[PDB]
Amino acid sequence: VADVVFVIEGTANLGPYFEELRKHYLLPAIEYFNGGPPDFGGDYGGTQYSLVVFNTVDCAPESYVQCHAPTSSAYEFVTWLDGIKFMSCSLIAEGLSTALQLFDDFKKMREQQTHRVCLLICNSPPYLLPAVESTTYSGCTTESLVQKIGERGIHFSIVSPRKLPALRLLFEKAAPPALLEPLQQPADVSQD
Amino acid sequence: FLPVMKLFDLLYPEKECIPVPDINKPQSTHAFAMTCIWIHLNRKAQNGDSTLQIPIPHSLKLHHEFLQIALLCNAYSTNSECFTLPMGALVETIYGNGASVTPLPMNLLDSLTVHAKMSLIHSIATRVIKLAHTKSSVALAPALVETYSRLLVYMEIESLGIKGFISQLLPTVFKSHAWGILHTLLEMFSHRMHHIQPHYRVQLLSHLHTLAAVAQTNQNQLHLCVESTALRLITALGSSEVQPQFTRFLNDPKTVLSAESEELNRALILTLARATHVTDFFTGSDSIQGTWCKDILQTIMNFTPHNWASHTLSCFPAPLQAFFKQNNVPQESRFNLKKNVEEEYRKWKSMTDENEIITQFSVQGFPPLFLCLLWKMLLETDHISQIGYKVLERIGARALVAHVRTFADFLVYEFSTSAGGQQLNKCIEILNDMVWKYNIVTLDRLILCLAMRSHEGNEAQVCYFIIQLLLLKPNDFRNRVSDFVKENSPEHWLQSDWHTKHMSYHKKYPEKLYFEGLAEQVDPPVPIQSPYLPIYFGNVCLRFLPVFDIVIHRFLEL
Predict the structure, then answer these.
(1) Ramachandran sector of residue B310 (left: φ over 0; alpha: ψ -120 to 50; beta: rest)
(2) A166 touches chain B (CB under 8 A)
């Protein structure tokens, strides 16, 4: 029922390359989970989706989390998607811990099962040695990945740029079927 | 439309689900509007094949397909392609069954019509014209005139609609007698449609006048409904409308206001004086504002009106046309009374051979001499002998007023012949029983005529005895009046069985005005008169007020 949660991390690593990926992957963001981008309201219909944004650790004395998307009403999403600012270990683990918490709250609130998906878009191939140190959860990258793969059957898609670093080979560790490997250059797919 | 609607629903529809299915017999639209507007948005989006077909109905999904108490018919069909199930299932016109024998009483307003207004525009409007285009061969099958006429918001939003309807019905004056559709709405428009906009009522008055002029009405001798509607129309606007309305009928008296109905014009100008009296429209100027009505007076004066001649001139706060009042030649210079009496005697004598020449004698009948010959009849124990009764019921009702003009004075003479009471009892026992057979005159012109030429200086103090004893005697129907009073105030608009009610009522006491009462040697009735007959005595219910005024307020002198 189109219960998605975006994860933007390449805001500080690669700024200008964001539009190059958006112009190609904006269709799966809206045109797949809806008819198209219009001017409409939102409700508990389940179609709502979120988007968390993060930056590197150097440009962060106090500000780490900005997960601001309760419902997004299927249109204000792309509206503030171009409005966020654009600014090495980019703290991807603490950035994914909040997405895991958001999915947990979804599963706790969406009781009366919507094939959840998430895009851990990271421009650079970063890595966060400290687990969270900023939230209730405390788990390393491997622990967070196996927890997001086992608990949630969400399609852990990794929409990285045209690069192919060693991040994909390690972040494809989703043991249940989640399609963590694809970096889709050809025509858009449903969720993979 | 969608922007503000969605912005308001984002704040109004703050909930979690779609509760309250709301069967809601009396008031369901208030709850179902949130889903109806959503369905309309869905249809508007699907018409363009975009906007995701107006998504997000989850807060109203239960009410979405609620289609599957007759008041649960939520008419969500206004969008498109749904005017078959809700509307078609409604109580439409009669088709199965066929005289006032029509089945299927009509619908109540507050039940369903409180919401199905912006959806029903040209359904009945085209249904009636389709039924009327070819002919009204059989008796009128539907009786939906109650619902159609009891639609005040209909004429509030589409006042021009009924004007267009009447204009498209106008060609029927050539189709067939303009009968099956004129006597359809004209009655209930006067009786049910009480409160209406006046700027259209003046146009309807002009149309009624040119109707009474054209076309012919000899077969429509039951056209008294036309005069009753005209009276109701010209007696209700007297508050303040004529002064702003003058610019509308500036040329109306110059073209059509004075065809034949001179008594209607007398009542019209009486009400016009009454209106100029409210409030003090003449104390300021006497000739400056004079031209506002002097044109109407000059147009009317070509037809010997205002015959009152200084006796009845009491309602005018400044009687202006009363300056030229001597131009009325009342009773033809006060000498032709006995002369026309002798002429009536000679006509009663020539009745011995007027039979074979009745066709050449009824041509204009020497207008104010012919139809009073019935008076000598019924004085010799039904001396009519049906010689020309069928001929008498042809065109006589028009000139009957001119006939009774001098006969008012003659009857005053017959009354004063008592001089103590010797002739009084004879007159009471003869005249009151003989006038009743047979006529429908119902004093429709005698009250005006009494002030025309009888209340003059001839026997004014004695012709004022008319209202004292002439029409004070009729008491034949007062028995059933006591039960006929309890039909409209107990049910203002709560009528569910009005059809059969008035059907049985008019089946009990009355038969018709064309019909006779005596079955003499030959009487071919030939009844065709069954267009529509919902009201029979509410017509005199209003003209009782002009009598009430000429008897007290207008004739306040004596």
Answers:
(1) left
(2) no
